[PDB]
Enzyme design. Structure first.
Site, mmCIF file in Angstrom:
data_model
loop_
_atom_site.group_PDB
_atom_site.id
_atom_site.type_symbol
_atom_site.label_atom_id
_atom_site.label_comp_id
_atom_site.label_asym_id
_atom_site.label_seq_id
_atom_site.Cartn_x
_atom_site.Cartn_y
_atom_site.Cartn_z
ATOM 1 N N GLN A 10 0.825 -1.203 0.000
ATOM 2 C CA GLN A 10 0.000 0.000 0.000
ATOM 3 C C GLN A 10 0.859 1.252 0.000
ATOM 4 O O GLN A 10 0.629 2.171 -0.792
ATOM 5 C CB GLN A 10 -0.932 0.016 1.207
ATOM 6 C CG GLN A 10 -1.702 1.311 1.355
ATOM 7 C CD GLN A 10 -3.014 1.129 2.079
ATOM 8 O OE1 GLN A 10 -3.105 0.364 3.037
ATOM 9 N NE2 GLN A 10 -4.042 1.834 1.625
ATOM 10 N N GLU B 56 -3.180 -7.221 -2.331
ATOM 11 C CA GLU B 56 -4.512 -6.690 -2.088
ATOM 12 C C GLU B 56 -5.023 -5.975 -3.330
ATOM 13 O O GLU B 56 -4.294 -5.180 -3.932
ATOM 14 C CB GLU B 56 -4.505 -5.712 -0.912
ATOM 15 C CG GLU B 56 -5.798 -5.681 -0.116
ATOM 16 C CD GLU B 56 -5.708 -4.787 1.105
ATOM 17 O OE1 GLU B 56 -4.581 -4.408 1.486
ATOM 18 O OE2 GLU B 56 -6.765 -4.467 1.686
ATOM 19 N N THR C 236 3.132 -7.261 2.913
ATOM 20 C CA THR C 236 3.334 -7.057 1.481
ATOM 21 C C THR C 236 4.645 -6.336 1.214
ATOM 22 O O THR C 236 5.472 -6.793 0.420
ATOM 23 C CB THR C 236 2.169 -6.272 0.886
ATOM 24 O OG1 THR C 236 1.912 -5.116 1.693
ATOM 25 C CG2 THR C 236 0.920 -7.134 0.812
ATOM 26 N N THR D 32 1.098 2.405 13.415
ATOM 27 C CA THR D 32 -0.247 1.969 13.074
ATOM 28 C C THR D 32 -0.426 0.459 13.097
ATOM 29 O O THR D 32 -1.567 -0.008 13.035
ATOM 30 C CB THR D 32 -0.646 2.493 11.687
ATOM 31 O OG1 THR D 32 -1.927 1.960 11.325
ATOM 32 C CG2 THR D 32 0.381 2.078 10.649
ATOM 33 N N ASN E 254 7.512 8.139 8.976
ATOM 34 C CA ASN E 254 6.270 8.898 8.924
ATOM 35 C C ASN E 254 6.223 9.969 10.001
ATOM 36 O O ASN E 254 5.696 11.058 9.767
ATOM 37 C CB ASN E 254 5.072 7.963 9.059
ATOM 38 C CG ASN E 254 4.748 7.243 7.771
ATOM 39 O OD1 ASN E 254 5.361 7.493 6.734
ATOM 40 N ND2 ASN E 254 3.767 6.352 7.823
ATOM 41 N N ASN F 44 3.501 11.430 0.793
ATOM 42 C CA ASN F 44 3.929 10.838 -0.465
ATOM 43 C C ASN F 44 4.358 11.905 -1.460
ATOM 44 O O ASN F 44 5.270 11.675 -2.257
ATOM 45 C CB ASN F 44 2.810 9.970 -1.034
ATOM 46 C CG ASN F 44 2.339 8.921 -0.051
ATOM 47 O OD1 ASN F 44 2.973 8.693 0.977
ATOM 48 N ND2 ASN F 44 1.218 8.283 -0.356
ATOM 49 N N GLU G 134 27.005 6.368 -9.635
ATOM 50 C CA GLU G 134 27.905 7.196 -8.844
ATOM 51 C C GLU G 134 27.474 7.292 -7.389
ATOM 52 O O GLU G 134 28.329 7.493 -6.516
ATOM 53 C CB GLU G 134 28.003 8.601 -9.444
ATOM 54 C CG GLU G 134 28.672 8.636 -10.808
ATOM 55 C CD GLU G 134 28.758 10.027 -11.399
ATOM 56 O OE1 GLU G 134 28.233 10.972 -10.780
ATOM 57 O OE2 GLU G 134 29.354 10.176 -12.486
HETATM 58 N N1 LIG Z 1 4.568 7.383 4.117
HETATM 59 C C1 LIG Z 1 3.509 6.607 3.915
HETATM 60 N N2 LIG Z 1 3.412 5.393 4.559
HETATM 61 C C2 LIG Z 1 2.337 4.598 4.365
HETATM 62 C C3 LIG Z 1 1.328 4.993 3.511
HETATM 63 N N3 LIG Z 1 0.395 4.026 3.496
HETATM 64 C C4 LIG Z 1 0.789 3.030 4.316
HETATM 65 N N4 LIG Z 1 1.988 3.374 4.868
HETATM 66 C C5 LIG Z 1 2.779 2.556 5.803
HETATM 67 O O1 LIG Z 1 2.886 1.252 5.265
HETATM 68 C C6 LIG Z 1 2.747 0.278 6.273
HETATM 69 C C7 LIG Z 1 2.075 -0.979 5.731
HETATM 70 O O2 LIG Z 1 2.267 -1.064 4.338
HETATM 71 P P1 LIG Z 1 1.731 -2.316 3.475
HETATM 72 O O3 LIG Z 1 2.514 -3.567 3.768
HETATM 73 O O4 LIG Z 1 1.844 -1.962 2.019
HETATM 74 O O5 LIG Z 1 0.171 -2.509 3.829
HETATM 75 P P2 LIG Z 1 -0.764 -3.439 2.895
HETATM 76 O O6 LIG Z 1 -0.843 -2.964 1.469
HETATM 77 O O7 LIG Z 1 -2.143 -3.576 3.493
HETATM 78 O O8 LIG Z 1 -0.026 -4.861 2.925
HETATM 79 P P3 LIG Z 1 0.065 -5.703 4.284
HETATM 80 O O9 LIG Z 1 0.080 -4.752 5.455
HETATM 81 O O10 LIG Z 1 1.333 -6.508 4.250
HETATM 82 O O11 LIG Z 1 -1.112 -6.636 4.395
HETATM 83 C C8 LIG Z 1 1.932 0.937 7.370
HETATM 84 O O12 LIG Z 1 2.450 0.591 8.631
HETATM 85 C C9 LIG Z 1 2.086 2.425 7.145
HETATM 86 O O13 LIG Z 1 2.891 2.974 8.157
HETATM 87 C C10 LIG Z 1 1.419 6.209 2.858
HETATM 88 O O14 LIG Z 1 0.528 6.571 2.099
HETATM 89 N N5 LIG Z 1 2.512 7.018 3.061
#
Ligand SMILES: Nc1nc2c(ncn2[C@@H]2O[C@H](COP(=O)(O)OP(=O)(O)OP(=O)(O)O)[C@@H](O)[C@H]2O)c(=O)[nH]1
Ligand SMILES: Nc1nc2c(ncn2[C@@H]2O[C@H](COP(=O)(O)OP(=O)(O)OP(=O)(O)O)[C@@H](O)[C@H]2O)c(=O)[nH]1
Ligand SMILES: Nc1nc2c(ncn2[C@@H]2O[C@H](COP(=O)(O)OP(=O)(O)O)[C@@H](O)[C@H]2O)c(=O)[nH]1
Ligand SMILES: Nc1nc2c(ncn2[C@@H]2O[C@H](COP(=O)(O)OP(=O)(O)O)[C@@H](O)[C@H]2O)c(=O)[nH]1
Lengths: 114, 430, 431, 431, 430
Positions: free
Chosen positions: E11, E63, E137, E171, E198, E220, E246
């Protein structure tokens, strides 16, 4: 442009003049039966019903389904029925508007479903 | 000058002929009434003094219904009324009924009309026989007509686009029986036989066209596109022209081995079109994908012997050569040791025309790959045990006996199919 | 242009024939006065299969009504569609067969059989091409069983190659209507095995079960049973009468259904039979139709398919449907119930598709099963026949009509040999 | 495209499930006739999670209703949203379980469980991908608890990897409805611990307390409690159905919530629950929603969190909000109430955000807390079960339904072991 | 011609890729439809014959929701449909789920598309992998794909822009677990790993952008601007061009030590813009301010090892030299004894483009400071206690065990982050 009608296993080959040409595209008459069959196959056999419903709703800005006959023609063209202009007009005339293009997609789909 | 006579035997032959002739009419601009508002139509149509074009085709069936649907439909003014030939009693899925008792007078009249059609052709590339291996009319009457054509016409190239029973799914019960009989018949008559399977084309429609409810009209549209791509080199000019005589001379390594896998590409619906490049190399790879085969037969089991590619549309020799080199270098595709080239590329400048109301989209390029490969022995192996599983109990044998066959005919047909298996193994092996 | 000559025999056969002809006239848009009122060219496409045209627009059924008593066809003529039939095709005796197969086959059938064959020949000669004859009658009744079997033998002698199709109302297992039902059924099955090319077995108790469980009717008259039977008889030949995506005639069904000549007895089922309450709640889909087809309750024969093994099974579908869906559904059925299907046949299903569904139905399907379950039906009838024959109960009625005792033994021996055929192919293993 | 199979059990479970389906149909713009009338693309984007498309535009819920008496689902069918469900999904017996878990799990549930699993398998096989099953029912009742535990065990056997979610209405502490509630609950908890992967604990009296103190209602029928439970059940899975800034599926919630598998019982709450009077006087802010969320009265569970320690807590917000706001608010809550949070877990917060709030509310938030407080609820259930079981009052019916008296000892022992888990992880020290 | 393949996993990866591709489209003028009204886009886009430019990116996720948001968003005609890869079941914040059971088929298809994409690139500067350490993920599938790329592609430079969990705010609950696992994985595969937090970016938005309610879109957008500053030298010319190849040699002292702080300057809203001089010296000092770090790690505890500065816009080399000389003479900034130079300056003539609807202002100058400093071991020290505190009670361990993982893997990951701690201590030491 004669029409061949098979009555009791023999080819009548009736003249076009005798046929009333109701211009409704009724599946009962074998002249328009292939047209209705093509429309039914393209709408249901080939296209998913959810896709058809989405396409029909897209033209319905009121979201009540009320589509004009011209919108129905555009929907058939978008759905790639492959019909000519006259055939599409007959397929649209299969249903009749209630007040002003008040036929909705569910009514049209019911008309072409069975 | 380059006339090809089309024969459509049985319900399947006629139903694919409907799609084929719709496609040809769309390609040449011929309205269904018969006349169009140069001389590229001469391969499939003969023009009369009034300007009307009549196809050089013959619809043969022992059942009246299928031909009468053509007589009643939109193409009622196009085909010749006597060219549509209808029987009175159906063959009832009985090869004996279609080959020995009912088929006699029907095939006699078929030869009469075919002779009339050939008298109207200055040249004659050959015959395109479309029938259904697995039905009494298609198998029996088709085999009888093929035998008579081999007797009288002689060296004319007869290309048989046969539809064989699918491995697991099927619609008939005596289908293995009449399939084995018809295979024994046409092993020695047709020049190039193209195998087609309903299961394979259903898979192609379900995956590539995203049709969850494919039907016979869709299958016939795909087959018609394949045949149109095959014959495009006769009707429209292009670089690297291929001829009907040239298909054999580049494809049939030995007289017995002339059965052909067919694959068309790309097969994409209107929705998913114009979303990828669909370049020459990509479409060649798609054509060589085993999933794109129109026969439920994995090419990975066997080895390709020859591959004829028919490119349609904006295709250039640079691109075809690069694509074929990539295919050769690909390790999954394996060729026989005694055919180092094994490739016959033919380009045509006419892109495949799109049938309105069909699911195929307007693509600027197309590839039709017709491959002679020893993998096709697998489908014969499947039918060879499907037949003999019933023949061990002699199930339905009395039906075939009642119309003038013997146990000897079944024995000889099954022995010939086993010999064909042995020949495929021998040619595939070093 | 492949004509079918319909024959009705006995009271039950005549009632079933009246219902069937009324159904067919409805389906082809024929009013009780014979005029076409359908407003659809598909109705007149192949009307010659069942009807002949009169001087006007009138269409007369190619039907021959048989009886040794006039009351049943007096009721037939008084029925709503009693005036379509040509009055010359009503062949009656004056003294009915007292539920006596001997009376209906030897004594009283002999005089009337000449007229019956004259009418049959007159109807058959008018045919351009003759697919065959379909005879609707009931086993376990005198005039019906005896006269029907005699006529079937005569027509077999006259027209060997033409198809013979039979719709026999075999006596019900649990409740027997007449006492002499095992005698009549045993004597008629022997004739049907030798003469009838194709036979459909119907049981009144099975029809009661299906109309009470599926249609959920609580007081079903014989009209409802005749209605279901008529639906089956229409659906079996709808492919001859209407264009189909994959059409299949009676001879094709016989070829794909009958592995060996003696094993031509079939159980039939018709779908979709929906209760009035659940009509809106039910979904017309090919999987739903197939699921209802392969249910044992849908069978109109008392024997359930679970006990036996399906030698063959034809499915004639009607409606604008996917051949892929149809073939995949029945292949899945075969794979799931491979224990209930014979091993030495790679494919036990004959799929046929017609493009024209029955009126009002989006889709429909008739199922014709050649299964070894009918073995238990024959076994029960033989269990009754042997019990009565050991003590010669009511045997004097047949003996005084000029039938030898040895004929009963021969018929029972033939029927037991047929049971042996069904059992042997049920337990027959490949290789 | 990750489907959920809903099951309703018992009278309370069936009523709550009907209310839940009404709420879901309202959210997705589905009228009681099944046609879509939502005027939003996102609503139809993921409608397959709960519904299947019928022959027309109708959408049928993927719900299966179970009962041993027909009256409850007769009322459900007569209710406002009774016609959406497929009739084949209504599985009922004829004699209702007399608040006997033994009757609903052994005697009368045994015959109906075959049909229940058949319908469940039919619904599950149609799903392209299956997230899992959700069973809504009430502990402390015969047919509800009995059939719920039996079906949960069967589904666990069939689909071990698929998610199992349960909404169990535990019998209330103070005012009890039936006499045998402690018996039924003790028997049900033993099965729920072993089989159900994820379980929500609800109380009628806790719902009454929240509806009088927060909602300030005057005459709250069972419908209002069912509405609150339905809101929680929607909010737990709104991430699957709607796009989210930080989405989280059921398995993600389970993984982040369950520290040890047997400690899978959770108390839930929904925010903002505001009285009709104070609608204008309250201001919808994320800090407000968090303050209401962490209030003891907001729990729908009788056990108050203050006595126990929060092992884990997930908060699924819905609406346009700042992830910084949410994360800062919940971190501040953890820091402020660190004594009430388990030390050996550095972060006890699983915060998820969905971009689509419920209709009418600008934003909402559902809370799912795994805390050691529910120890006192299980302790109270044991204090009732032991009181009755020491004299074996009311026990002879259960003994007569074919369950051994040792099973009660098994169930009480297992529930007391769960109590021990909660207490020891409450008093566990880091390092 | 200097193509870089973009990968976005999970995500967070996909959602930062949304901003990244919006920024690249705005920078190269490529409209959302796919085509723009020289050859500067080749690094991120491949142009087709029709004129449509498709980005050389791959969106990988188990997902479907996040990828479907892209498929339905404004950028539906830009991205390649097969390039968007969607799974069926989410990893559910389980590293084992995303690396052992669900991720296998998805990563196989991912390598298929990555091979196709890399075939269309003449050269290949490297990969830009955007993922989220702290979710199954991102952690599991991202680690698996990084292993795949390291083994097959090999010496191509992979830059992993990883987001680790913040010190206090978080989170997820198993976030220490899967973060430790994915760090254990990527210590050996990525060539340069850019650290992000974050909490740090939230603080940046709060103080500098004055955003009291920062959100993922803002985070982002900031990350995308940082990456665009990184890649500006590949697409636009300017004095002191710096190459992807480099970066490592100028920034990585030892193979394991390749984690890097990133800091952008200026971060000022429009209202505060054009109200201060924003000179090269001032923006450089701001970039070296501790608060400007995009990771919650005080640079003062450690010592800088190397600092690579990317200047965008009207920057003159004497100004960069004067600013960096003042930085060196500054007492607060402390370098290691063994890297006297420790500075890699690179300028570019293209000022940073501003996304409409964003908070960042149009500033004629920009600096991205990417620094290798021994301080960053502090964040790993935080996670090393967050992990073992839970692992002592083995909470949530059964979830990871269920999808094919063992106690040994947890122990080894903890051992490896302890090894990384000692490595940072040792590089800090004399
Ligand atoms: N900087 C930033 N961090 C994000 C954002 N969205 C999610 N995260 C971070 O990404 C973490 C989880 O990412 P993912 O593994 O991709 O979540 P997911 O797509 O539901 O996949 P799984 O959690 O493995 O099931 C969270 O703990 C957030 O802190 C975003 O838009 N910006
Ligand atoms: N691919 C394809 N195959 C078809 C189609 N129609 C029929 N078939 C096949 O053709 C076979 C039967 O064809 P026919 O022999 O002509 O059937 P018929 O016209 O009734 O003649 P008989 O079966 O011999 O009595 C079936 O087994 C089908 O598999 C079609 O439209 N497309
Ligand atoms: N389905 C159906 N069966 C009938 C009807 N009338 C009689 N039967 C059955 O047919 C069986 C034989 O009676 P039947 O042959 O008509 O007597 P017959 O005319 O004197 O030979 C009896 O057992 C009845 O149960 C009817 O109208 N419909
Ligand atoms: N929330 C809610 N609870 C109910 C409702 N109806 C009954 N209950 C409670 O559910 C508890 C269990 O009853 P239940 O299991 O449904 O009885 P059973 O169906 O005979 O097994 C009772 O103590 C009731 O207090 C309802 O409509 N809503």
């Amino acid at each position: 442009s004669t029409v061949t009608l098979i009555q009791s296993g023999r080819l009548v080959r009736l003249q076009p003049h005798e046929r009333p040409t109701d211009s409704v595209a009724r599946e009962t008459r074998t002249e328009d039966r292939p047209i209705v069959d093509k429309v039914h196959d393209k709408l249901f056999k080939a296209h998913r019903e959810r896709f058809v419903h989405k396409v029909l709703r897209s033209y319905a800005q009121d979201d009540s389904g009320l589509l004009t006959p011209d919108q129905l023609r555009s929907a058939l063209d978008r759905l790639h029925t492959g019909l000519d202009a006259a055939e599409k007009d007959r397929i649209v005339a299969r249903v009749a508007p209630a007040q002003h293009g008040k036929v909705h997609y569910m009514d049209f789909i019911r008309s072409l479903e069975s | 000058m380059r006339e090809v006579i089309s024969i459509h035997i049985g319900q399947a032959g006629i139903q694919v002929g409907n799609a084929c002739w719709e496609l040809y009419c769309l390609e040449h601009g011929i309205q269904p009434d018969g006349q169009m508002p140069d001389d590229a139509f001469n391969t499939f149509f003969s023009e009369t003094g009034a300007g009307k074009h009549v196809p050089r085709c013959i619809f043969l069936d022992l059942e009246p219904t299928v031909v009468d649907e053509v007589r009643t439909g939109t193409y009622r003014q196009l085909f010749h009324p006597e060219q549509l030939i209808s029987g009175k009693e159906d063959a009832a899925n009985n090869f004996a009924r279609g080959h020995y008792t009912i088929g006699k007078e029907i095939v006699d009249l078929a030869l009469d009309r075919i002779r009339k059609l050939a008298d109207n052709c200055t040249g004659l590339q050959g015959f395109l026989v479309f029938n259904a291996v697995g039905g009494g009319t298609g198998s029996g009457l088709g085999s009888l007509l093929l035998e008579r054509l081999s007797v009288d016409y002689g060296k004319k190239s007869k290309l048989g686009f046969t539809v064989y029973p699918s491995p697991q799914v099927s619609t008939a019960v005596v289908e293995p029986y009449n399939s084995v009989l018809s295979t024994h018949s046409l092993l020695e008559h047709t020049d190039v036989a193209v195998m087609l399977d309903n299961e394979a084309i259903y898979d192609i429609c379900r995956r590539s066209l995203d049709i969850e409810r494919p039907t016979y009209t869709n299958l016939n549209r795909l087959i018609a596109q394949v045949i149109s791509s095959l014959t495009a080199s006769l009707r429209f000019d292009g670089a690297l022209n291929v001829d009907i005589t040239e298909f054999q001379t580049n494809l049939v390594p030995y007289p017995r081995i002339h059965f052909m896998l067919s694959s068309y590409a790309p097969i994409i619906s209107a929705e998913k079109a114009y979303h990828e490049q669909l370049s020459v190399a990509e479409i060649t790879n798609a054509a060589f994908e085993p999933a794109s085969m129109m026969v439920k037969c994995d090419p990975r089991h066997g080895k390709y012997m020859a591959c004829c590619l028919m490119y349609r549309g904006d295709v250039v020799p640079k691109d075809v050569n690069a694509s074929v080199a990539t295919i050769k270098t690909k390790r999954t595709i394996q060729f026989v040791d005694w055919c180092p080239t094994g490739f016959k590329c033919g380009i045509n400048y006419q892109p495949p025309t799109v049938v309105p109301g069909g699911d195929l989209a307007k693509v600027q390029r197309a590839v039709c790959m017709i491959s002679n490969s020893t993998a096709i022995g697998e489908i014969f192996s499947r039918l060879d045990h499907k037949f003999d599983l019933m023949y061990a109990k002699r199930a339905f044998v009395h039906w075939y006996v009642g119309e003038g066959m013997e146990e000897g005919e079944f024995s000889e047909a099954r022995e010939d199919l086993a010999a064909l298996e042995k020949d495929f193994e021998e040619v595939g092996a070093e | 242009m492949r004509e079918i000559v319909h024959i009705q025999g006995g009271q039950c056969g005549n009632q079933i024939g009246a219902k069937f002809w009324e159904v067919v006239s409805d389906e082809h848009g024929i009013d009780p006065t014979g005029t076409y009122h359908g407003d659809s060219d598909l109705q007149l496409e192949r009307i010659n299969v069942y009807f002949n045209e009169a001087t006007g627009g009138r269409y007369v059924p190619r039907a021959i009504l048989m009886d040794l008593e006039p009351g049943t066809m007096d009721s037939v003529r008084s029925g709503p569609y009693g005036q379509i039939f040509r009055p010359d095709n009503f062949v009656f005796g004056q003294t009915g067969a007292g539920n006596n197969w001997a009376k209906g086959h030897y004594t009283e059938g002999a005089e009337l059989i000449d007229s019956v064959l004259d009418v049959v020949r007159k109807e058959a000669e008018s045919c351009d091409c003759l697919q065959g004859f379909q005879v609707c009658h009931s086993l376990g009744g005198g005039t019906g069983s005896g006269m029907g079997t005699l006529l079937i033998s005569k027509i077999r002698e006259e027209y060997p190659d033409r198809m013979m199709l039979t719709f026999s109302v075999v006596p019900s297992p649990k409740v027997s209507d007449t006492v002499v039902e095992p005698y009549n059924a045993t004597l008629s099955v022997h004739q049907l095995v030798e003469n009838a090319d194709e036979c459909m077995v119907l049981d009144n108790e099975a029809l009661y079960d299906i109309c009470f469980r599926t249609l959920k009717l609580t007081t079903p008259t014989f009209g409802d049973l005749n209605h279901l039977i008529s639906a089956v008889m229409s659906g079996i030949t709808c492919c001859l009468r209407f264009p189909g995506q994959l059409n299949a005639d009676l001879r094709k069904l016989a070829v794909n259904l009958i592995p060996f000549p003696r094993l031509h007895f079939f159980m039939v089922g018709f779908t979709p039979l929906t209760s009035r309450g659940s009509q809106q709640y039910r979904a017309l889909t090919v999987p739903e139709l197939t699921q209802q087809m392969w249910d044992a309750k849908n069978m109109m024969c008392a024997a359930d398919p679970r006990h036996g093994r399906y030698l063959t099974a034809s499915a004639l579908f009607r409606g604008r449907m996917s051949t892929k869906e149809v073939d995949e559904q029945m292949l899945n059925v075969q794979n799931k119930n491979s224990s209930y299907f014979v091993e030495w046949i790679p494919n036990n299903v004959k799929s046929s598709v017609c493009d024209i569904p029955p009126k009002g139905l989006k889709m429909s399907a008739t199922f014709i099963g050649n299964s070894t379950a009918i073995q238990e039906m024959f076994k029960r009838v033989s269990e009754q026949f042997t019990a009565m024959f050991r003590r010669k109960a009511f045997l004097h009625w047949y003996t005084g009509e000029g039938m030898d005792e040895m004929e009963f033994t021969e018929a029972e021996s033939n029927m037991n040999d047929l049971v042996s055929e069904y059992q042997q192919y049920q337990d027959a293993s490949a290789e």
